[PDB]
């Protein structure tokens, strides 16, 4: 048994009462983050602990292979805190966990992803001050939870 059922009338919880928490399909918006270069053995739930560390997440849609059923190495997610997007992406881009680092860029409804030529400018500064640079705490958290799960060999859904 590996599922979450809330108790109707007994605690509404902070933000876990919803079974299937964080939408598995992320509605196309400008606060949609694209994470590329992530381990194929990490899916939405497992990557949540890395991404949600910076702010509250609303939806998480990993690119999953339809052939055999594993992560394709990329994911799309959106912060409910639309403001946190700019800070989180600035802190999470280049997130280096062990020997693998993720490329976190903006999907923006299939805009261009980081621009890379005109469409990726006007942001070369004014990031220091608002970004909480605790990627150390996020790293430790993520890597220890990844180890806790055993690299997709268990669960960390402690919802009781």
UniProtKB/Swiss-Prot annotation:
One of its GO terms (cellular component) is commitment complex. The modification Phosphoserine is found at residue 66. GO terms for molecular function: C2H2 zinc finger domain binding; enzyme binding; molecular function inhibitor activity; poly-pyrimidine tract binding; pre-mRNA 3'-splice site binding; RNA binding. The keyword Nucleus applies. The modification 5-hydroxylysine is found at residue 48. It is found in: Nucleus. Residues 31-109 form the RRM domain. The keyword Repeat applies. Its main location: nucleus. GO terms for biological process: mRNA processing; mRNA splicing, via spliceosome; negative regulation of mRNA splicing, via spliceosome; negative regulation of protein ubiquitination; positive regulation of RNA splicing; spliceosomal complex assembly. It comes from the Eukaryota. Keywords: Acetylation, Disease variant, Hydroxylation, Intellectual disability, Isopeptide bond, mRNA processing, mRNA splicing, Nucleus, Phosphoprotein, Repeat, Repressor, RNA-binding, Spliceosome, Ubl conjugation. Plays a role in pre-mRNA splicing and 3'-end processing. By recruiting PRPF19 and the PRP19C/Prp19 complex/NTC/Nineteen complex to the RNA polymerase II C-terminal domain (CTD), and thereby pre-mRNA, may couple transcription to splicing. Induces cardiac troponin-T (TNNT2) pre-mRNA exon inclusion in muscle. Regulates the TNNT2 exon 5 inclusion through competition with MBNL1. Binds preferentially to a single-stranded structure within the polypyrimidine tract of TNNT2 intron 4 during spliceosome assembly. Belongs to the splicing factor SR family. It is linked to Developmental delay, dysmorphic facies, and brain anomalies: An autosomal dominant disorder characterized by global developmental delay with intellectual disability and speech delay, epilepsy, hypotonia, short stature, microcephaly, intermittent exotropia, and non-specific facial dysmorphism. Brain imaging shows a thin corpus callosum and/or delayed myelination. Interacts with U2AF1L4. Heterodimer with U2AF1. Binds unphosphorylated SF1. Interacts with SCAF11 and SNW1. Interacts with ZRSR2/U2AF1-RS2. Interacts with RBM17. Interacts with PRPF19; the interaction is direct. Interacts with POLR2A (via the C-terminal domain); recruits PRPF19 and the Prp19 complex to the pre-mRNA. Interacts with KHDC4 (Isoform 2). Interacts with ZRSR2. Interacts with the SF3B complex composed of SF3B1, SF3B2, SF3B3, SF3B4, SF3B5, SF3B6 and PHF5A. This is Splicing factor U2AF 65 kDa subunit.
